[PDB]
Model the fold of this input.
Amino acid sequence: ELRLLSKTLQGQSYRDQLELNPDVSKAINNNIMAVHIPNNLRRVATNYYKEIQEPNSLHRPCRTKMEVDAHIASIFLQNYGSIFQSLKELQKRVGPDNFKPQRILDVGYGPATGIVALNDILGPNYRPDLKDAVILGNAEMQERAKIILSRQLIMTNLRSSIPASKEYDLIILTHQLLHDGNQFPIQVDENIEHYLNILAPGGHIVIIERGNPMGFEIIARARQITLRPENFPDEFGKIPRPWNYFLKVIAPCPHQRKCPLQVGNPNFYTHKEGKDLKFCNFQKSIKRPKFSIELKKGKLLATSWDNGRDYEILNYSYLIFERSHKDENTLKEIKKLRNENVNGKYDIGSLGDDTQNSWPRIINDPVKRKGHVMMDLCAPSGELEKWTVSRSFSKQIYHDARKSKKGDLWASAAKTQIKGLGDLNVKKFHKLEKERIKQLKKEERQKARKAMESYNELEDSLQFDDHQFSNFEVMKKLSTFHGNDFLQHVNRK
RNA sequence: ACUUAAGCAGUGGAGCAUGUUAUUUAAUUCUACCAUAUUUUGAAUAUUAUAAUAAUUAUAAUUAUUAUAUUACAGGCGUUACAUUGUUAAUGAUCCUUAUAAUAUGGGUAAUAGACGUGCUAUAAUAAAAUGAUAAAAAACAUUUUAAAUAUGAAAAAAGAAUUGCUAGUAAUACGUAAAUUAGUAUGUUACGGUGAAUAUUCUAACUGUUUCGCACUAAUCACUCAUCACGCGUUGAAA
RNA sequence: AUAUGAAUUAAUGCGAAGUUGAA
Ligand code: SF4
Done:
């Protein structure tokens, strides 16, 4: 626990090692797995892992009870850390006082997972009115969710579908903005819109995803459709955005403008040219409990599939929105803020409003050498930035930057604040796609003359009938002519 | 059909070794890190000048060299969320230039509540110790002694989860030899030979692919369909 | 009887996101 500076404290993110409640670990390893002989649980967990090892895949509901317990094993470990960190980010950014939500909803394939994390977070003295929690996967998951929640302090209401006769002030989503690899662009909009309807005034939505390029794509698309950066050009900073309804981003994003890292299609992470592309992931460390230690052992699961750790480094992407309060106050407040005080063109190097909301976020592990720390930042201006701190520019700023880590908000000035030039090829890619759209319309027009001259050549020497073109090849042209015709037909659809 | 049950061979609580994590720290780097002093064209190339040296022209002019200044800069174990080549360091781009460069001293990389992996040695008598034939790229044989926390071990005894392999020149060997990294270090890896067993498979079995049936499922059983509970809007039917 | 209106009243159609059963 370092002195650093008071501002550096608010800037820093929760870096402590993660741990499950010992009661919960004892409960799981005593009941949920002791009856099961470990081999079958390991087999079903391995099955679950193998079908996500595929590039840019998505997680799936747990079909059968053995897969149910295997999901309790493998993914509770990861999702608990993800939610715990994201909720800590939320609590700290909004302040510890504003976060006393009464109406609580959690959606995810796992057990009541946001519920347990929230309980552990704000402590065992917390007894709201409502603690609804839907479990998508299986009925057998709810009894084990009850088992887990019993050891903590039940009022949690285990459902199977979203109750839609009530609004909520706190909502958590885990792996819910998509369910199919295909249909990716649009299911995110449908799913998010489904939940934004049931977010009460002043509430918060906390979305957590896998943290691989597909997941980053999901968060980026959700942010784009919700904020709509293009609808408010030249508007820097964070003012709530429409979607009598208004929403703003709490974290990780430090700007409401477009995401600099967004490339539209996940599949292009799979190409040779996409071998250096980068995405807004976020790592954390959590120490393995007994069962994982007992579980992740054997040739099947504890070897190179072809030394051990006490902990897992989990990747996840996440997003948060804060909702404004329905009132004669907030609406006019937002309207006037958008009218009379634009926050100007925040320059590269700027710190935004110089409050925790608009601080640059450290989106890569800072690289540290003698005297100087360099940082890769998503800036409140919104461009990728390399900021270098030195012993020269100061001693204290160097001290703080030299303890800086990924996922922290850096909150000071630097001697150089240049653009993050490297792997900004997403901006080069934004050119390529727009090239295609304009030149796509040349493609059909080229294809017209390409096929016309081919057939005009055909008819000349087939009307003249010298038949220099072979019977095999001539009938090949006719195949191309009609085949090209049909392919144009369906492309209209 | 792994695996299990059996039989056999074992290993598994102790320590260290070797790492990792955490916590701690001014650092506990990823000599490269911390504290205190201390150097600013520095390491090179060029410019432009005053000093000597030469060569010329004519003391001066020029050219060099050599110093001293001279600033472009040099320098950077800075960057790959800095690229392209090259390979399995370079160019470029950018960043620092009383500092991110340079030197010195000391300190750290070895801190220790914990936690986990990898191996070696132990815990005695179908087995250790002392003494006396054979390889490829010494165990063996012989004799004797041998306590009961020792004369074992260089805490460790009793019981457990776990786990490794199962006819084979395989396992195991308190059997050794050798190579590379190396100025020096191996309990790590690699090969390389010598000796050469035990023991038998009722059983269970996920996963598992074929499959058979039905389907009203087609995002595929969390599938779809049906009924309930509420809100409004209609349509028609009787009517004192 | 052929119509036209009616307090009172029967059934059913639709749709909004859902709520409840497991036919
Ligand atoms: S790069 Fe910045 S804007 Fe994009 S998702 Fe990450 S934090 Fe948000």
Q: What stands out?
A: Residues 161-165, 197 of chain A lie near RNA strand C (CB under 10 Å from a C1'). The two ends of chain A are 61 Å apart (CA to CA). The CA atoms of residues 86 and 226 of chain A lie 19 Å apart.
